[PDB]
Design a protein around this ligand. Structure first.
Ligand SMILES: OC[C@H]1O[C@H](O[C@H]2[C@H](O)[C@@H](O)[C@@H](O)O[C@@H]2CO)[C@H](O)[C@@H](O)[C@@H]1O
Length: 369
């Protein structure tokens, strides 16, 4: 099954009947030239959906869903994961270089929608009843829905059970636990310091929290240069007892054979760690020629139990926004911890200046080194 745009036939029949060069035998060579150029042009290629998703999510699982959508409709589906896609998209979507569907945490999506780059989505009232209502409220900008909520991500504390059978309950006791582990050739805690998404849970429980984090670097309990790749390698080789990450990382820990748990983030000054909750969402490019087709792949293929499961087997989503699948998924204790850290945190805003917010928080952490 291969589906083409209806305009390709229209252009092709108009090219034959309406052309003087196709009417008389003297000009049949021009007629063939013109028919050949149209035949190879993009308009007469098979209709495709391009999807952008971050390279740490289950794009391989998402693509199997796309191959089923192609088995049922002939609309090819191409999933890509270009780097820094949340910054390539606004530079590229007005022209014809953007995807038909973009996946990102709901917070970048306000800047896009204010710039007119996302189409307003049209779910039925019945379809919306299948998702948790606080997730629709996150993908709403100026009273308009601008994306489909996929998953609810929050950071969790992840600990190696062989090195720390009981994870700490407070941040303030991590120095003491580090001194013990360092004697065993280990360390207590590594996590990505280069992304403010990861430090904010501690800053938000602002002056004293960033201080404690700085006093952790200064007392040699952590390294200022530790980024995502450095922390995951240390944890997945059992060189550190705790890390801070989200559900996407569970896949790589299963293969390393670390006996790991997932639990609430430790408290600071007696209060819960308040991390930023992002709703992973699918937005439809306002420059897409197949907006309606993108609505059907998302409402009828992805956002069903089977579709979310095919993504989740690749890289776990954590807690999904679809109620039917979250009542099952939440029996898993890892997802329960994620839902606990989401409860005790705050959902991030989707203002257009959010990007500048993040720049400020990133730069304040780095320069505090
Ligand atoms: O670095 C700040 C960052 O925070 C959030 O991004 C997260 C994202 O939600 C997760 O999917 C993870 O995979 O990537 C980021 C952390 O490295 C915001 O959504 C994003 O706008 C912001 O840049």
């Amino acid at each position: 099954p291969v589906t083409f745009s209806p305009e390709c036939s229209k252009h092709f029949h108009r090219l034959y009947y309406n052309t003087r060069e196709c009417s008389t035998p003297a000009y049949y060579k021009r007629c063939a030239r013109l028919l050949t150029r149209l035949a190879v042009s993009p308009l007469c290629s098979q209709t495709k959906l391009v999807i952008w998703i971050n390279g740490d999510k289950g794009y391989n699982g998402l693509a199997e869903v796309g191959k089923k959508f192609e088995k049922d409709t002939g609309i090819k589906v191409t999933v890509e994961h270009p780097d820094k896609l949340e910054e390539k998209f606004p530079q590229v979507a007005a022209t014809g270089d953007g995807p038909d569907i973009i996946f990102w945490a709901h917070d970048r999506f306000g800047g896009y929608a204010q710039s007119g780059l996302l189409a307003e989505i049209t779910p039925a009232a019945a379809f919306q009843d299948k998702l948790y209502p606080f997730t629709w409220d996150a993908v709403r900008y100026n009273g308009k829905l601008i994306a489909y909520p996929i998953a609810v991500e929050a950071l969790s504390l992840i600990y190696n059970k062989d090195l720390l059978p009981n994870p700490p309950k407070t941040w303030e006791e991590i120095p003491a636990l580090d001194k013990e582990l360092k004697a065993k050739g280990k360390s207590a805690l590594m996590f990505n310091l280069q992304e403010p998404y990861f430090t904010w849970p501690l800053i938000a429980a602002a002056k004293a929290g960033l201080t404690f984090l700085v006093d952790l670097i200064k007392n040699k309990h952590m390294n200022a240069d530790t980024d995502y790749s450095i922390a995951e390698h240390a944890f997945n080789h059992g060189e550190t007892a705790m890390t801070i990450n989200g559900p996407w990382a569970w896949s790589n820990i299963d293969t390393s054979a670390v006996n790991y748990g997932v639990t609430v983030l430790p408290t600071f000054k007696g209060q819960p760690s308040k991390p930023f909750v992002g709703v992973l969402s699918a937005g439809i490019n306002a420059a897409s020629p197949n907006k309606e087709l993108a609505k059907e792949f998302l409402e009828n293929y992805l956002l069903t139990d089977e579709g979310l499961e095919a993504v989740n087997k690749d890289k776990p989503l954590g807690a999904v926004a679809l109620k039917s699948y979250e009542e099952e998924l939440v029996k898993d204790p890892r997802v329960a911890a994620t839902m606990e850290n989401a409860q005790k945190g705050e959902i991030m805003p989707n203002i257009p200046q959010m990007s500048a917010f993040w720049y400020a928080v990133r730069t304040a952490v780095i320069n505090a080194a």
